Design a protein around this ligand. Structure first.
Ligand SMILES: Nc1ncnc2c1ncn2[C@@H]1O[C@H](COP(=O)(O)OP(=O)(O)O)[C@@H](O)[C@H]1O
Ligand SMILES: Nc1ncnc2c1ncn2[C@@H]1O[C@H](COP(=O)(O)OP(=O)(O)O)[C@@H](O)[C@H]1O
Ligand SMILES: [Mg+2]
Ligand SMILES: [Mg+2]
Ligand SMILES: [Mg+2]
Lengths: 50, 56, 154, 439, 223, 529, 523
């Protein structure tokens, strides 16, 4: 997320419904791209998400 | 200044506080003779008291 | 005492009572004015002065000489701009009349409370022969209204 | 981000010594430096106020400055002194004498050159620092004089880092130094144009809460540090623990400070009353929140009923359910809404932390921006003006190398600052002579 | 002292309704300043203010004063508490910030274009606003007591203003609403300074300065 | 007694009591300070409330570190410091004269003499002494060999013999390297750095700079054989708008775009440096070093590390100037005018690690106008002892250069004034001859103390010295290993001229003021509360 | 439970009170009467903060003393009115007040009402003033060698008397320069434009008065020049830094190009400021507030020199010296507000510290006195002495009159009053004579401090003045022999004598009108 304060703004019905689906799809591709190089173990120095 | 002196003193006897505002009123209404009024008032009481001790 | 600076005696006064507020417009809903262009700043200043000016022109139109406001604690009741205009139009202003003696005031002089500018006409005014504030020797200032044309039983 | 804490003078060192003490016992740190906690929630943000040295040791990010070794030796020899960094102790040899001129011109000038080197060495160990914290009192010469000089030097060095401070406000009923008003007026003049905000605390309400409400007919300063150290923890608490919304100190400025010049707050700490009342008062949400708008939990001599609040912020600590907190907050917001804001509705900022401060069942923290603070600054100016007319004790200041014009200069700003707060009330705008003629 | 007292009283004689005269004492300002003997205390035919000019660069004596009395502060303008500023196009920010300092500039030029030399204000004056008085060569004073301003306005014929608006939209400042005095001088009286206004033309006014050995003795003559 | 009837809690000490207190307390400061004079003086130990240890032999350092609470011990201490920050040497001799000067004046006063009579004696003696000193001074060229003697004579009274041999060469060399023509010597350009390792005989001079911090990224090179130096104080740290601002987006995709965009202000600055590095350092043979006065984000470090650009963050303000004159670059605040003409040069850069702390060396500059002194030792108290001795050495050399003259020391000059002041006293009139006689004995405390601390007899030795200089007109001083008369200039003992001129001025003024004090009184408010 | 009327307020009355106040007044005089005359010794005082005040000044002694008695508080207060008014004579005023109050108790014990004494005291004061003006001497201010003797006669009693010949030159040059006629016909000699700077070390013979000012600052960026010959200088008031507004502002940004553009707009705004300053081509820029790092980069490009954070008290002196005036907004910078009256700008090091010099002005109206010496305590006594001299010189320039010193005037006035009292009939005759006889405590104090016979010397001097033309004879304060004041050359301004007599008489009137004391009423 942005280091500066950042809020999500929605003005229509579609944006409210499509926000949650959009976030999950983006996360799937990022992890799959990592696994595409062949990594077997990931080590991080911070918090992990569910 | 008679009014200034009395205003600066601390008094709690109610019979004396009446005189303190007596001099204060003479200041607002006129502005002079604030010492003459206090003397007269205290002399009227003292002289009337001896009349009351006699059965009047 | 009177808020006005200069006027302390009125002859053949026409007295009117007000229960609304002479200030910037204010809605019960939580409102706010948003500015995004530099020309808007000058518009706000001009539009506020016109709104206050409009109110005073209505009051003077009916021949009112003495004005009585009612106390308010949620919004201002008499702004500096409003008091300046009422001075130029020669209107005696008395502010912060209590809410619990409004009945007694209306009874004595026969006025009628008003709550909207659109209902400030010449039929809601009371008449008095003399309105003046008197200055006691040293105790303080006092106000007197004498010579009511339509007297009550008070 | 990274923050640094700096303490100066008598009052500043004492509070800071307790502050680091009421941080180590939460995060699993011990007076030797190791971490002995089993909860990983404590070590996630452990590095915001700490540095890690090789071997698992942790050290605070603190600078201790005083002009006399007596205070610094007390902390060094006393509890937790072995934890601190050895070189961070900076001390003089002669003191300040509480002459604001001595601490602002003569002695502080030759000490900052050495202190400024230390803060650079601490700032070099952080990838990206975010701001500073200063703890000082407005009565002592070093707190006011050297505190003013330090801030001016800091501003020139560091362009846009935030400047948070925790300053105690003098209570003139407790006058102490015969020349108290000279010290207070000048420092506030400099503080107005060089800090984001200041958190004021008076020893009067510090005296009242323990004595009357709780117990201990003779409360010494040692307890007074604990009460303010409780307030130290909370404004700062969110920073060391995670939350659903990342509340950093910078967004505190924008969201709590509508105007860059009216930026003085007074905090609040509810869950502390009589020891019997600590047990028998049913410490539920609405009675605990009821202490926010009380006349007792305040720690400033400013009546709120004769004032109008600008913005409020509420911090909650403890593991509750989400519903009841909002329910009572909804209730309280409209319960006493009559005495609320003039033009800034819905100010309430709600923050919740799962782990409470260690020791008690329940805890919260409150911050409010009042228009009644002018009642405090007015009284300071009135006493100041009465002394300047007589020029009493003026030679001790003018004779040290400072021009007389400064005393008259600082007075103007105080009247200017008071006029600002007065303008936002519209109620204080409400005669002896007989001139009421024609026009 | 009896000659001083009677002259001051006769200098404030007022003519009132039908035939009643009026002598409003306490409309004469009494000032105390230790120093020379009390026999050198002087009566002033005019008025005296316990204030000093705002800035050093400004002049300190005017030989023909056109006095303007004001009741509002002269500082950089600022939108009211109800009005907020939201910016979505960055190019508009620069013009926004100029208008804060430019509205006040235009008000000053309206005041100074009519010939005002001395400005008196109960409110404060920002340091930037003092510069315009410096270049135009005018004298200005800030933080003036209300009761003092009432007497000077009465004596010099000026009119106290709490705003600039007129019976129309725009703001104007005519020349028929200015005071006039024969001289304004800042003097030195025992290590401090004050302001003297001499020979007001609309009416007469007087003030008394008292001198004594010290402050306790000075306070006694005042009472 | 006229002040007790007003404020009974006041403390006073009237006419003869006031003189008794001042004279008896000024002598107290002399009885302990007289063992510091000369290279044979004894080293004291000082311990504060925390338990620290600070060995010292200096005069000014001793004054402020001894537990004393006295009014007349406060006037003397303030003068000693004022003689320290200006001249840099001569604080112990200051106290000895003031105490001895008050003792002699008290000798005649106790017989019933008014103190003002002796005061006029001091002024007449002071004027004559300043005229005698003006003709004894020796003018020379200030070559390197002469400066060695002056520096050695001041470094020998504050460390053991073998160490003063090492520090003398470093102090003389450092002054010469930074010395341009007639332009005055500007200190703050001789960096004093201390490293707590190794024996204390490894104190050396480095013809460049040393910095107390180094590379922070792991993959940065630890040594560079030919470097370009870039000196700038611009910030490569993430920064936010002065006016309040926040990010409003609509979905996950737009959130990423705003994340990447916000680094563009800083990433532009980093690209400017890299573009310059490719140009001047076309091949992978030279080096490039960036010294910044501000912070650097980890993202900025990673970009720089991929190009082999050594970078340091948050250096001190003074080094923004020293590096300019050492390497030869330009200290710039912005990158909108970057050009190859503004880079410096340095022949070797490497990094040293000392346990917890790290150091970086900038060496082999073409023509350095600034150098650094590196202090090494096995203890904290030893490093401070070396540091103070270095300060006095630089001031003594610099004064010998600013002035064109050097005055022989070893106790020779005061004997010469003593001789000339005796032959002038018959000329003056009145009882002021007693004042002149009092001054003449005051100047003889320096030769006495020197002989006394070496283990000789005061009366027998001083008469031997005055036996000479009266039959042979040469300037003769005291020898510290034989007690025999010794020609000061021929051996190599020297003393600054400004030190002696100011020392005579200061001492006479205080003793003049102290003797005229009527009473000591403390009648004001007890404490500032 | 208890009945009270005034609740813990003390009260005293009767002849005890009148004797109580007089005995308190005399005690203060006994403290200070050893500090009068050229043979005066010093006193050292101790303050709550631990400093030492080694001083001879009459006022300085009293302002460090705490006294409860109401009567004593009056004497302390009139000390500082004299200093603020005429700057000299804070000791002779106290000694007179005690003596004029002490020779009054003789009449009180002979059942004499105080109002009879008071009418006699103020009656003698008018003849005191008229007699003083009669024997006044007119002076020609255009004679420099005469003005040096006036200042020398007022500092021969202080510590700088050794360096007197230097001190008179420093005091005279400064006052001769700060003199300023301005709009209208208001002539002033203000003294906030003569700064006194102390620097420990050197020698007292290194003191000098500069044609300009000195500043304890240094150049912000090292590359900026440190030696300029004829600088063109501008004085600012605002800050060269992009600071926030005050109108409740906030920015909402929804595009990639808005965050970077906003940041770039702050650097363009500063470049707008720096370019406008450069338009006037100056060489030195002085400002009250901070200077951003960017602003220095543009300024050093155009070969400018800048100074940060100068006190408002120093700009006003610089503005008067160089000839510039302070401008707050650079958009209104012109050619009439640029100062070209300097002649040098130099930055030196004085003991590990940087100073800034602006000297060799064409016609400065502000000066900065530089002092060097042993330590802070000695220099503190130097400036207190110098201030008296510069206050003495000013009074001569406003009222060019002189009267003989050394006690000659007091005896001349004493003789005139005594010969006039024998034409007076009534009981007021006696107080009218004792007041005149109370003046002779001035020569008597001078004799005792010298170490002479106060009985023999005073009776011979009183007999001397009885003759027709000997009004200028006084007492030499170093040998103890009656000498004429024409040849010795001692004079003091007429203003000093008038204030000493006026203050002394009026204070005695104040304390003679007392009858009782009430205390401890807690506001
Ligand atoms: N080798 C030497 N032989 C004789 N006298 C010496 C020698 N070295 C130094 N001195 C004398 O020691 C005196 C004191 O110098 P020092 O010990 O540094 O203390 P200070 O300089 O403070 O008096 C000088 O006057 C000098 O003449
Ligand atoms: N050389 C002198 N011989 C005799 N009297 C002197 C001499 N110099 C000064 N005086 C006298 O000293 C008196 C007071 O001077 P001073 O000691 O400064 O006290 P103050 O000025 O506080 O009254 C003057 O009245 C003057 O006549
Ligand atoms: Mg009366
Ligand atoms: Mg030495
Ligand atoms: Mg004198």
């Amino acid at each position: 997320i942005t280091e500066t304060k950042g809020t999500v703004l929605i003005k229509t019905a579609e944006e409210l419904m499509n926000f949650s689906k959009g976030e999950e799809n983006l996360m799937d591709a990022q992890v799959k791209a990592i696994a595409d190089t062949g990594a077997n173990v990931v080590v991080t120095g911070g918090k992990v998400a569910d | 200044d008679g009014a200034t002196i009395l205003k600066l003193l601390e008094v709690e006897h109610p019979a004396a506080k009446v005189l303190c505002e007596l001099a204060d009123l003479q200041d607002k209404e006129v502005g002079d003779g604030t010492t003459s009024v206090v003397i007269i008032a205290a002399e009227l009481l003292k002289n009337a008291d001896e009349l009351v001790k006699q059965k009047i | 005492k009177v808020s006005n600076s200069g006027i302390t005696r009125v002859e053949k006064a026409k007295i009117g009572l007000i229960q609304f507020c002479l200030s910037a417009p204010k809605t019960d809903m939580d409102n706010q004015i948003v500015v995004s262009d530099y020309a808007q700043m000058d518009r706000v200043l001009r539009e506020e002065r016109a709104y206050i000016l409009n109110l005073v022109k209505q009051i003077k139109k009916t021949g009112c000489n003495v004005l009585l406001i009612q106390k308010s604690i949620l919004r201002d009741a008499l702004s500096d701009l409003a008091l300046h205009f009422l001075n130029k139009m020669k209107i005696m202003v008395i502010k912060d009349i209590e809410r619990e003696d409004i009945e007694f005031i209306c009874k004595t002089i026969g006025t009628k409370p008003v709550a909207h500018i659109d209902q400030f006409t010449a039929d809601m005014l009371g008449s008095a022969e003399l309105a003046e504030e008197v200055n006691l020797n040293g105790s303080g200032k006092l106000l007197k209204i004498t010579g009511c044309a339509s007297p009550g039983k008070t | 981000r990274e923050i640094v804490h700096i303490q100066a003078g008598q009052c500043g060192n004492q509070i800071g010594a307790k502050f680091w003490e009421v941080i180590s016992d939460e995060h699993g740190i011990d007076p030797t430096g190791t971490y002995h906690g089993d909860s990983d929630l404590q070590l996630d943000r452990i590095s915001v106020y700490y540095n890690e040295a090789t071997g698992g040791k942790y050290v605070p990010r603190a600078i201790l400055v005083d002009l006399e070794p007596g205070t610094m030796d007390s902390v060094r020899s006393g509890p937790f002194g072995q934890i601190f960094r050895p070189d961070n102790f900076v001390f003089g040899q002669s003191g300040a004498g509480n002459n604001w001129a001595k601490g602002h011109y003569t002695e502080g000038a030759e000490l900052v050159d050495s202190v400024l080197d230390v803060v650079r060495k601490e700032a070099e160990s952080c990838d990206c620092l975010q701001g500073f914290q200063l703890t000082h009192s407005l009565g002592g010469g070093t707190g006011s004089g050297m505190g003013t000089l330090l801030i001016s030097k800091i501003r020139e060095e560091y362009p846009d880092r935030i400047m948070n401070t925790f300053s105690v406000v003098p209570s003139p009923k407790v006058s102490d130094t015969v020349v108290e008003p000279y010290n207070a007026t000048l420092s506030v003049h400099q503080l107005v144009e060089n800090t984001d905000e200041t958190y004021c605390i008076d020893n009067e309400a510090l005296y009242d809460i323990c004595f009357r409400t709780l117990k201990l007919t003779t409360p010494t300063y040692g307890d007074l540090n604990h009460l303010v150290s409780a307030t130290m923890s909370g404004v700062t608490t969110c920073l060391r623990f995670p939350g659903q919304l990342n509340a950093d100190l910078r967004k505190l400025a924008v969201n709590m400070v509508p105007f860059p010049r009216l930026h003085f707050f007074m905090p609040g700490f509810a869950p502390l009353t009589s020891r019997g009342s600590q047990q028998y008062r049913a410490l539920t949400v609405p009675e605990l929140t009821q202490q926010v708008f009380d006349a007792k939990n305040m720690m400033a001599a400013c009546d709120p009923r004769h004032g109008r609040y600008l913005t409020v912020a509420a911090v909650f600590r403890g593991r509750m359910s989400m519903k009841e907190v909002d329910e009572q907050m909804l209730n309280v917001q409209n319960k006493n809404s009559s005495y609320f804001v003039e033009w800034i509705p819905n100010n309430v900022k709600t923050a919740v932390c799962d782990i409470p401060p260690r020791g008690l069942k329940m805890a919260v923290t409150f911050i409010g921006n009042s228009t009644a603070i002018q009642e405090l600054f007015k009284r300071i100016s009135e006493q100041f003006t009465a002394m300047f007319r007589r020029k009493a004790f003026l030679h001790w200041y003018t004779g040290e190398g400072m021009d007389e014009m400064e005393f008259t200069e600082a007075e103007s700003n105080m009247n200017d600052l008071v006029s600002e707060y007065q303008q936002y009330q519209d109620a204080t705008a409400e005669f002896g002579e007989e001139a009421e003629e024609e026009a | 002292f009896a000659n001083m007292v009677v002259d001051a009283v006769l200098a404030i004689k007022y003519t009132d309704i039908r035939g009643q005269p009026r002598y409003p004492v306490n409309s004469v300002n009494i000032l105390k300043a230790h120093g020379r003997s009390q026999m050198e205390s002087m009566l002033i035919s005019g008025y005296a203010l316990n204030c000093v000019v705002g800035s050093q660069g400004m002049p300190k004596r005017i030989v023909n004063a056109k006095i303007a009395c004001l009741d509002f502060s002269l500082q950089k303008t600022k939108m009211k508490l109800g009005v907020q500023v939201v910016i979505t196009d960055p190019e508009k920010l620069d013009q926004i910030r100029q208008r804060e300092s430019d509205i006040t500039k235009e008000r000053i030029q309206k005041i100074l274009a009519t010939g005002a030399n001395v400005i008196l204000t109960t409110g404060g004056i920002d340091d930037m606003c003092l510069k315009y008085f410096v270049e135009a060569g005018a004298m200005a004073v800030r933080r003036v007591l209300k009761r003092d301003l009432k007497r000077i306005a009465k004596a010099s014929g000026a009119t106290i203003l709490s705003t600039l608006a007129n019976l129309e939209g725009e703001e104007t400042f005519e020349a028929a609403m200015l005071g006039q005095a024969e001289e304004v001088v800042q003097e030195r009286i025992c290590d401090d300074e004050l302001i003297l206004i001499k020979n007001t033309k609309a009416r007469t006014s007087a003030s008394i300065i008292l001198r004594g050995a010290n402050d306790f003795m000075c306070d006694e003559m005042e009472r | 007694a006229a002040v007790k009837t007003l404020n009974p809690k006041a403390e006073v000490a009237r006419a003869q009591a006031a003189l008794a207190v001042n004279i008896s307390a000024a002598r107290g400061l002399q009885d302990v300070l007289r063992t510091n004079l000369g290279p044979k003086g004894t080293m004291k130990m000082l311990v504060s409330g925390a338990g620290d240890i600070k060995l010292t032999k200096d005069g000014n350092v001793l004054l402020h570190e001894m537990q004393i609470q006295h009014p007349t011990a406060s006037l003397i201490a303030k003068v000693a410091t004022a003689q320290d920050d200006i001249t840099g040497d001569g604080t112990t001799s200051n106290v000895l004269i003031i105490g001895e000067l008050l003792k002699q004046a008290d000798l005649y006063i106790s017989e019933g003499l008014h103190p003002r009579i002796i005061t006029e004696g001091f002024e007449a003696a002071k004027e004559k002494a300043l005229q005698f000193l003006e003709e004894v001074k020796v003018s020379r060229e200030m070559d390197r060999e002469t400066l060695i003697d002056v520096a050695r004579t001041s470094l020998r009274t504050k460390v053991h013999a073998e160490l003063a041999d090492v520090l003398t060469e470093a102090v003389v060399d450092s002054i010469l390297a930074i010395k341009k023509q007639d332009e005055p010597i500007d200190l703050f350009m001789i960096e004093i750095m201390e490293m707590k390792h190794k024996s204390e005989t490894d104190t050396s001079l480095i013809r460049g700079l040393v910095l107390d911090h180094g590379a922070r990224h792991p993959d940065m090179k630890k040594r560079v054989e030919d470097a370009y130096i870039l000196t700038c104080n611009v910030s490569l740290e993430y920064e936010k708008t002065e006016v309040n601002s926040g990010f409003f987006y609509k979905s996950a995709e737009e959130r990423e775009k705003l994340v990447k965009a916000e680094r563009k202000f800083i990433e532009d600055r980093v690209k400017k440096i890299i573009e310059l590095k490719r140009k001047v350092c076309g091949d992978s043979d030279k080096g490039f070093v960036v010294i910044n006065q501000k912070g650097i984000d980890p993202f900025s470090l990673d970009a720089l590390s991929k190009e082999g650009i050594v970078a340091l963050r948050r250096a001190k303000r003074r080094n923004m100037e020293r590096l300019t004159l050492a390497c030869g670059g330009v200290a710039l605040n912005s990158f909108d005018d970057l050009s190859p003409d503004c880079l410096g040069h340095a022949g070797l850069v490497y990094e040293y690690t000392l346990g917890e702390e790290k150091f970086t060396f900038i060496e082999k500059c073409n023509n350095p106008r600034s150098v650094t002194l590196l202090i090494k030792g096995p203890n904290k108290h030893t490093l401070t002892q070396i540091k103070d001795a270095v300060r006095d050495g630089l001031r003594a050399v610099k004064n010998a250069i600013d002035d064109g003259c050097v005055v022989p020391g070893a106790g020779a000059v005061e004997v010469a004034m003593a001789e000339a002041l005796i032959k002038h006293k018959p000329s003056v009139k009145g009882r002021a001859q007693l004042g002149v006689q009092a001054f003449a004995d005051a100047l003889l405390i320096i030769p006495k103390v020197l002989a006394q601390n070496s283990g000789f007899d005061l009366q027998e030795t001083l008469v031997k010295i005055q036996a000479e200089h009266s039959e042979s007109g040469q300037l003769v001083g005291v020898d510290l290993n034989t007690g025999e008369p010794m020609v000061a200039a021929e051996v190599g003992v020297w003393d600054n001229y400004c030190v002696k001129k100011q020392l005579l001025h200061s001492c006479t003024v205080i003793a003049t003021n102290i003797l005229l004090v009527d009473e000591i009184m403390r009648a004001g408010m007890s404490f500032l509360k | 439970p208890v009945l009270v009327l005034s609740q813990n307020t003390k009260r005293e009355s009767g002849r005890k009170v009148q004797s109580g106040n007089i005995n308190a007044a005399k005690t203060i005089a006994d403290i200070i009467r050893t500090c009068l005359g050229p043979k005066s010794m010093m006193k050292m005082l101790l303050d709550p903060m631990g400093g030492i005040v080694m001083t001879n000044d009459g006022n300085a002694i009293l302002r460090e003393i705490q006294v409860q008695h109401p009567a004593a508080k009056s004497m302390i207060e009139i000390s500082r009115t004299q200093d603020e008014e005429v700057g000299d004579g804070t000791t002779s005023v106290i000694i007179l007040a005690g003596e004029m109050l002490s020779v009054a108790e003789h009449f009180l014990e002979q059942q004499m009402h105080p109002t009879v004494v008071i009418s006699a005291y103020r009656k003698a004061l008018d003849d005191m003033i008229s007699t003083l003006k009669k024997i006044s001497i007119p002076v020609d201010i255009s004679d420099s060698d005469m003005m040096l003797n006036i200042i020398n006669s007022s500092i021969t009693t202080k510590a700088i008397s050794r360096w007197s010949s230097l001190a008179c030159n420093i005091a005279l040059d400064a006052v001769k320069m700060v003199q300023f006629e301005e709009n209208g016909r208001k002539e002033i000699d203000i003294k906030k434009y003569a700064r006194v700077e102390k620097i420990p070390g050197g020698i007292i013979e290194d003191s000098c008065v500069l044609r300009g000012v000195m500043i304890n600052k240094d150049v912000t960026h090292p590359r900026m020049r440190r030696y300029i010959k004829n600088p063109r200088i501008v004085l600012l008031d605002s800050s060269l830094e992009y600071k926030k507004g005050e109108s409740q502002t906030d920015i909402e940004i929804t595009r990639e190009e808005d965050f970077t553009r906003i940041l770039q707009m702050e650097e363009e705004y500063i470049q707008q400021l720096c370019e406008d300053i450069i338009q006037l081509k100056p060489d030195v820029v002085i400002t009250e507030k901070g200077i951003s790092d960017l602003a220095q980069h543009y300024l050093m490009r155009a070969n400018i020199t800048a100074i940060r954070r100068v006190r408002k008290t120093d700009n006003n002196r610089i503005a008067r010296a160089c000839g510039a005036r302070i401008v707050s907004r650079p958009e209104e910078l012109r050619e009439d507000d640029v100062g070209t009256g300097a002649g040098l700008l130099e930055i030196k090091k004085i003991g590990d510290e940087y100073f800034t010099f602006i000297t060799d002005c064409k016609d400065p109206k502000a000066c900065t006195i530089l002092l060097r010496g042993a330590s802070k305590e000695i220099l503190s006594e130097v400036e207190r002495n110098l201030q008296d001299a510069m206050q003495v010189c000013r009074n001569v320039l406003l009222d060019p009159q002189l009267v003989p010193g050394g006690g000659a005037s007091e005896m001349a006035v004493a003789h005139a009053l005594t010969e006039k009292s024998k034409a007076m009939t009534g009981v007021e005759q006696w107080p009218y004579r004792a007041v005149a006889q109370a003046l002779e405590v001035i020569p008597r104090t001078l004799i005792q401090n010298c170490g002479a016979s106060t009985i023999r010397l005073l009776t011979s001097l009183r007999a001397k003045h009885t003759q027709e033309n000997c009004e200028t004879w006084g007492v030499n304060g170093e040998t103890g022999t009656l000498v004429d004041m024409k040849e010795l050359g001692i004079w003091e301004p007429l203003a000093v004598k008038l204030q000493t007599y006026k203050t002394a008489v009026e204070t005695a009137v104040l304390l003679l009108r007392i009858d009782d004391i009430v205390s401890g009423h807690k506001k």
